[PDB]
Design an enzyme around this catalytic site. Sequence first.
Site, PDB file in Angstrom:
ATOM      1  N   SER A 297       4.894   2.507   7.566  1.00  0.00           N
ATOM      2  CA  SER A 297       4.662   1.313   6.730  1.00  0.00           C
ATOM      3  C   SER A 297       5.859   0.946   5.856  1.00  0.00           C
ATOM      4  O   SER A 297       6.572   1.817   5.356  1.00  0.00           O
ATOM      5  CB  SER A 297       3.457   1.498   5.809  1.00  0.00           C
ATOM      6  OG  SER A 297       2.253   1.207   6.488  1.00  0.00           O
TER       7      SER A 297
ATOM      8  N   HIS B  69       0.791  -1.235   0.000  1.00  0.00           N
ATOM      9  CA  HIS B  69       0.000   0.000   0.000  1.00  0.00           C
ATOM     10  C   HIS B  69       0.824   1.287   0.000  1.00  0.00           C
ATOM     11  O   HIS B  69       0.276   2.377  -0.126  1.00  0.00           O
ATOM     12  CB  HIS B  69      -0.986   0.014   1.170  1.00  0.00           C
ATOM     13  CG  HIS B  69      -0.383   0.452   2.463  1.00  0.00           C
ATOM     14  ND1 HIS B  69      -0.108  -0.423   3.489  1.00  0.00           N
ATOM     15  CD2 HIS B  69       0.005   1.674   2.895  1.00  0.00           C
ATOM     16  CE1 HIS B  69       0.426   0.241   4.499  1.00  0.00           C
ATOM     17  NE2 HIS B  69       0.505   1.515   4.162  1.00  0.00           N
TER      18      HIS B  69
ATOM     19  N   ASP C   4      -0.072  -7.371   2.393  1.00  0.00           N
ATOM     20  CA  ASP C   4       0.434  -6.020   2.184  1.00  0.00           C
ATOM     21  C   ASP C   4       1.949  -6.151   2.039  1.00  0.00           C
ATOM     22  O   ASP C   4       2.711  -5.993   2.996  1.00  0.00           O
ATOM     23  CB  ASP C   4       0.039  -5.155   3.388  1.00  0.00           C
ATOM     24  CG  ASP C   4       0.293  -3.679   3.173  1.00  0.00           C
ATOM     25  OD1 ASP C   4       0.596  -3.263   2.035  1.00  0.00           O
ATOM     26  OD2 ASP C   4       0.172  -2.928   4.168  1.00  0.00           O
TER      27      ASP C   4
END
Lengths: 36, 284, 259
Positions: free
Chosen positions: C205, C43, C99
Amino acid sequence: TFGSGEADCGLRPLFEKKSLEDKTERELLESYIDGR
Amino acid sequence: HPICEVSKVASHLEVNCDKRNLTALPPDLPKDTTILHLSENLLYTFSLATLMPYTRLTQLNLDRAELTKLQVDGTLPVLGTLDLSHNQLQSLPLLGQTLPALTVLDVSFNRLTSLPLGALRGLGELQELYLKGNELKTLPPGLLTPTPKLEKLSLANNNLTELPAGLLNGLENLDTLLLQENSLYTIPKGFFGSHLLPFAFLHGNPWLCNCEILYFRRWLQDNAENVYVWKQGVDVKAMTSNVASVQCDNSDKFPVYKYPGKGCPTLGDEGDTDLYDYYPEEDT
Amino acid sequence: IVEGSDAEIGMSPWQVMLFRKSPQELLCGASLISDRWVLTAAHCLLYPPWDKNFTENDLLVRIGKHSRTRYERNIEKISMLEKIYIHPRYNWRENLDRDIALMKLKKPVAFSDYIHPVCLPDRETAASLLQAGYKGRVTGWGNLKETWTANVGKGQPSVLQVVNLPIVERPVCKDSTRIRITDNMFCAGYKPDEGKRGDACEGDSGGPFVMKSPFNNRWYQMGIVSWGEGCDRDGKYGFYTHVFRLKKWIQKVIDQFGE
Ligand SMILES: *[C@@H]1O[C@H](CO)[C@@H](O[C@@H]2O[C@H](CO)[C@@H](O[C@H]3O[C@H](CO[C@H]4O[C@H](CO)[C@@H](O)[C@H](O)[C@@H]4O)[C@@H](O)[C@H](O[C@H]4O[C@H](CO)[C@@H](O)[C@H](O)[C@@H]4O)[C@@H]3O)[C@H](O)[C@H]2NC(C)=O)[C@H](O)[C@H]1NC(C)=O
Ligand SMILES: *[C@@H]1O[C@H](CO)[C@@H](O)[C@H](O)[C@H]1NC(C)=O
Ligand SMILES: [Cl-]
């Protein structure tokens, strides 16, 4: 087949390789023991 | 020794013959000299082969000695630094085949008006090139091809009007680019390419802001934090960025990073971002 | 990273910064697993719901850094991307299942005191280290607090941050959120009754969740900062992409082409 980097991976030049430990890696190791 | 000063430590020898009205290298110096300071002498002409010995020489300072002819003869396989600044050279010396381990070359403040065809051929280890204060009007295509490891390039205070669109091709490690105080009015298509340039000096130029100053227009936008104003040494140009220093026509109040291309082609290609708002907040 | 501390120099040599070319901005963390492969969260590159879709040419990767914004002379290395590989079954529509994305550097990078790859867990290592209670380590240059709403304190750090967190048992992870969890993720963080705090946050992230093997003394990357709800909120936990479970897809792309 070849990646170039492993077999040596996870060993830090400024720490493991110099037989030096960082300030909090002990926190990690102590968690491997049953905390009851 | 009786003429220059000699010192040792770490095993490297450093001889200092500055300001001694010398017209040639003094009578036999330590064979194990690493640093040689021949600044401010009277070396109108100098032969490199005359240093052939002293096979441990790494740094050579021949600045401010009004040199107009440098005879590139022998070899100095260990010479790393070479200061030829503040002299009278009218033609850039071909140091390729002679100085292979050279990493720092300073031929600043001389009388260069153009650079040879294969000017830097053979200097693959070059990290810093200083040509500030000369009178170069145009740089040749492929000038830095032989120096893919270049980290710093100083072309300030010359007479440059336009730069070769592909000057920075390669240069994987270029972090400093000095082009201030020149005669530049615009920047080629993809002059800066994809590489990140930490320190750029583009002020003191008569940027002609029209429709083909857009590429540079957005580049400045993206690199607003990487444009600085040169002041001097010891200052460490890492103090307060200043993108606004790049002004149209060198016309003060007309920063180039704020020039609407009004009636210019393609309404979406050059400087088509600035879409969203941001509210950053870092600390000390 | 919320409630963590400044990292020591070279403490996380595999730490990678995903940098956006235009405009120039830090967009995510990542990790180096070899001289030419970087692992991150899918993402960070592709998230249709926010119209995010970054290509190879839109990014640069900064390796060996400590400071968040200062260019670090002959310490950091800046590499370009040859190719981006996002898991074919990355679920951006509901919970960011799988992810993960691999990035192939255009040129191999040389190691140094500041640049060194982390290890990917093997069967025994995974089964042995992935236990509730066991602590891992997360690093990143992400937010120090929730920045989408007024709060005291700085938003981002000037230096890489680090925090050690306990792995949490699935049932507890599951009942702490309304978002549907999968076997392809795990959560960590201190429970309401433990006292200590700490969590990843926006901007973290791609960053790695690593653990040191008491057996061979090597560091292995068990997770990838993936998501959460708020940062360091009580009863909430940070979720991470379960690297070992996606090991087969990782090997398949890594060893797919010669070299
Ligand atoms: C994330 O964003 C990416 C770009 O930011 C998206 O990729 C881009 O997609 C567009 C299509 O919308 C591509 O368009 C051009 O290329 C296609 C051919 O595609 C294939 O070949 C390209 C190389 O030539 C590759 O780059 C593609 O990945 C793919 O393999 C052409 O068919 C198009 O031609 C059309 O337009 C011209 C005029 O411009 C007409 O003359 C033609 O007749 C035709 O109508 C385009 O030339 C674009 O190339 C592509 N760029 C990149 C970097 O891939 C990506 O899809 C998106 N991802 C997601 C998940 O949303
Ligand atoms: C270069 O610029 C200087 C500064 O104005 C000028 O004096 C000099 O004549 C110029 N050199 C050439 C070759 O025109
Ligand atoms: Cl985010």
